[PDB]
């Protein structure tokens, strides 16, 4: 029987399943291809039930869990073959986590009702230190310095991690065995973020040498290097289109890279508190941009260190909408600790009123692709879920989840169920210190673990 027949069979059965579920079939079929048109087509934010979400925090042994990448198989309509690597792995949801202890851990997250379940791990250490001391010889199988970022391949066949060791190691998903190591070939080329082009084998790896690198995992080779940032490229986001977006931290710039045209678009906040104060007749000036996620092929959101969450449009260079001090202000330092003075009133004068106060940083920020909902994270102790307006010109706080306590290093979301009826699980790495370094003062109650929240929508 020819494969044309086989596609015909799977197609015919698939239609019957659609008919069994139910005009409607035509509408549903158009929705299957909405991914091709880079426009938000998942308008379900109102349906969410933030209040009734089932939250759970799973403690993990390792210190300072830095990142988490969730792999979710998807049935390809074109060939009706699930993305799962193997038949045993059918419909199984996996999560991969990395920490500063040089350990990569995978979990099974198929069961929303149950907590994540550890499956396998591989740990690095001094054994892997390169003797040669040359960059092109930095090809040891394991890590020897902090791991920072992880990504799980859309085909489910590889998970690749990078960190301060200036290496890119790709791991086989099943056995967590090293299969290839790609050096960055730079004295300061530390990897700061990774992104898989949606439903493809291409990597975009952001490095501390102010460049973005791209790889093709299937061929195990690097393709091009992108230039233009004036400062470290802390975070990077990608969708199915080759339009990867990045943020430059202190440069206060978000650069969208059109790989197809070999051109880049510069977006700068340019928010100045003189005008913001004048129009008002406490505001903090932005210091750096850390987190970025691409809501749509034509939109993206960024989170700065001044607690400002911005919405951007490819058409406009300046932000279309900003939410200042989204996560709130840090509590004031203790007056008993500001100075050693005995007299209280003199200690209070040290606080200088409210001048010393600062806003929380947006440590994490994730948007469900082609959707109108995105999640923000900080060490305020609560994850915040937002909704973008239908016209994609504004947004509002949909709700909050109070389970998480500590620095939110990275957030992920996974869904299950039929098209109409879906349950969403929110997985976020929580650590006791910020991923890049140890600046943040220790937060009361912070614990290293994987925060979880299952949410279903009704209406």
């Amino acid at each position: 029987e020819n494969p044309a027949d086989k596609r015909r069979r799977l197609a015919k059965q698939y239609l019957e399943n659609l008919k069994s579920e139910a005009d409607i079939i035509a509408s549903r079929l158009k929705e299957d291809v909405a991914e091709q048109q880079g426009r938000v087509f998942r308008y379900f934010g109102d349906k969410l039930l933030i209040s009734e979400a089932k939250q759970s925090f799973t403690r993990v042994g390792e210190n300072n869990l830095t990142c988490i990448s969730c792999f979710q198989p998807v049935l390809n309509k074109y060939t009706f073959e699930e993305s799962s690597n193997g038949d045993k792995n059918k419909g199984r949801l996996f999560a991969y986590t990395v920490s500063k202890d040089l350990q990569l851990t995978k979990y099974d997250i198929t069961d929303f009702s149950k907590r994540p379940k550890k499956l396998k791990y591989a740990k690095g250490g001094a054994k892997y230190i390169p003797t040669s001391k040359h960059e092109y010889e930095n090809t040891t199988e394991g890590h020897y310095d902090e791991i920072l970022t992880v990504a799980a391949s859309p085909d489910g066949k590889y998970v690749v991690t990078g960190g301060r060791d200036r290496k890119l190691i790709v791991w086989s998903t099943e056995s967590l065995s090293p299969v290839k190591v790609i050096p960055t070939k730079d004295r300061r080329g530390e990897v700061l973020s990774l992104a898989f082009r949606k439903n493809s084998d291409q990597l975009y790896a952001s490095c501390a040498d102010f460049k973005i690198r791209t790889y093709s995992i299937n061929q195990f080779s690097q393709l091009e290097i992108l230039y233009g940032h004036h400062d470290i490229v802390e975070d990077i986001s990608a969708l199915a289109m080759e339009r990867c977006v990045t943020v430059g931290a202190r440069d206060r710039t978000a650069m969208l890279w059109k790989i197809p045209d070999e051109t880049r678009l510069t977006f700068r906040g340019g928010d100045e508190p003189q005008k913001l104060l004048r129009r008002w007749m406490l505001f903090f000036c932005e210091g750096s941009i850390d987190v970025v996620s691409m809501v749509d092929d034509f939109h993206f959101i960024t989170g700065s260190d001044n607690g400002n969450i911005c919405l951007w449009s490819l058409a406009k260079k300046k932000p279309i909408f900003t939410e200042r001090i989204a996560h709130g202000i840090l509590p004031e330092p203790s007056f008993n600790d500001i100075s050693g003075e005995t007299d209280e009133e003199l200690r209070k004068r040290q606080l200088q009123g409210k001048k010393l106060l600062q806003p929380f940083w947006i440590t994490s920020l994730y948007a469900i692709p082609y959707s109108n909902v995105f999640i923000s994270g900080s060490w305020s102790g609560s994850l915040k879920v937002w909704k973008i307006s239908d016209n994609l010109r504004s947004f509002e706080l949909l709700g909050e989840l109070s389970g998480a306590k500590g620095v939110v290093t990275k957030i992920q979301v996974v869904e299950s169920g039929k098209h109409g009826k879906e349950k969403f699980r929110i997985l976020a790495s929580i650590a006791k210190e910020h991923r890049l370094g140890r600046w943040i003062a220790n937060v009361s109650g912070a614990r290293n673990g994987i925060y979880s929240a299952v949410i279903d929508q009704t209406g």
Partner: protein, 171 residues
Amino acid sequence: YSTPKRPYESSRLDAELKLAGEFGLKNKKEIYRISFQLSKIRRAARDLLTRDEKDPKRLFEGNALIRRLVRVGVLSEDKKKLDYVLALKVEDFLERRLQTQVYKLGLAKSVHHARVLITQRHIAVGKQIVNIPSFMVRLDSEKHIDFAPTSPFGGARPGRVARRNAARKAE
């Protein structure tokens, strides 16, 4: 370039010696080239000043020249006036040269070390390998100066001598 009016003045010889030593130039021809450029710029600025203020010619060409000089970096952002264009000197132009910028950024230990690095194709501005020391660096290109990806100092494989001695050591 154009020869100065009286090349043999003692003050001129000592000036050229100082500039050469400080920026490691090869010949007085480089100094003459920069001086000729500066002379044209300053003469234009003067002729604009002679005109009346609010003159459309003065305004248009004046802001054009100020914008260009700022873009090259010689004129700072806070001095956007032709009067300061008259106050420019040859040292400002020589400083913007790629040799001097490479020296200052810390990539080389000396101006001559910077020259041999650049002429040896070890220095890249963005994506492009620039082996021309007299290359002029703008503002935006100032931060993008780095070692070229192909350079052994840039992470590629070692030069001829390194691997040759490695082979001789291994055998």
